[PDB]
Design a protein around this ligand. Structure first.
Ligand code: NDP
Ligand code: TOP
Length: 157
């Protein structure tokens, strides 16, 4: 099963200067919970931002770079390769993978971050005409998690 995993704000911002625009530990716990034991496919800039492969899942990086051979990362050089990956595969970002994949995935796990951040990278527009809300769960706030957010799971109609 092929899924998107993304956090985006009220205007679909995902990213600023190759980093997440917000500090939201609870989103990152959500990401850990969902993707542990599965596979992640991310483009090269997302990989560099994170800087290491994430533990306890297959990390797959998409890059035209044929010298890319990183310890604990599988490399693919085409979108077409994503389909040969076994198991539950999460399209992990960033902008350019989302744009390529949004029409192809079974479902999306979206954290809607309920604020308006400066961004330089966006998730593509989508409509609920196309996507059934399987679930919608308000994120709990505390002093360390102070931005309202909602976890959506959307299934393509
Ligand atoms: N909020 C969220 O949920 C998430 C946010 N982000 C954010 O997104 C931003 C980065 O996004 P973006 O700039 O689009 O970059 P990406 O992370 O998507 O990666 C860009 C690169 O991916 C590689 N790539 C993508 N498509 C292909 C292809 N078909 N063939 C070969 N290589 C390909 C290329 O690498 P090369 O040039 O090396 O060939 C390309 O330059 C960051 O700010 C980051 O913080 C990222 C993930 C999630
Ligand atoms: C695990 O830490 C990171 C995760 C992500 C991707 C990501 C983050 N949040 C959500 N909801 N979905 C995603 N695909 C992107 C990151 O930086 C660009 C990360 O470093 C902080």
């Amino acid at each position: 099963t092929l899924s998107i995993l993304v956090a985006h704000d009220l205007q679909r911002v995902i990213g600023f200067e190759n980093q997440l625009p917000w500090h939201l530990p609870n989103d990152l716990k959500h990401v850990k919970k969902l993707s542990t034991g599965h596979t992640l496919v991310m483009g090269r800039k997302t990989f560099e931002s994170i800087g290491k492969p994430l533990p306890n899942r297959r990390n797959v990086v998409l890059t035209s770079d044929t010298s890319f051979n990183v310890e604990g990362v599988d490399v693919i050089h085409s979108i077409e390769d994503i389909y040969q990956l076994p198991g539950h595969v999460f399209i992990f970002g960033g902008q350019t993978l989302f744009e390529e994949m949004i029409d192809k995935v079974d479902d999306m796990y979206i954290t809607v971050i309920e604020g308006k951040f400066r961004g330089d990278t966006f998730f593509p527009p989508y409509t609920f005409e196309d996507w059934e809300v399987a679930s919608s769960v308000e994120g709990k706030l505390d002093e360390k998690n102070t931005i309202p957010h909602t976890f959506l799971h959307l299934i393509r109609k």
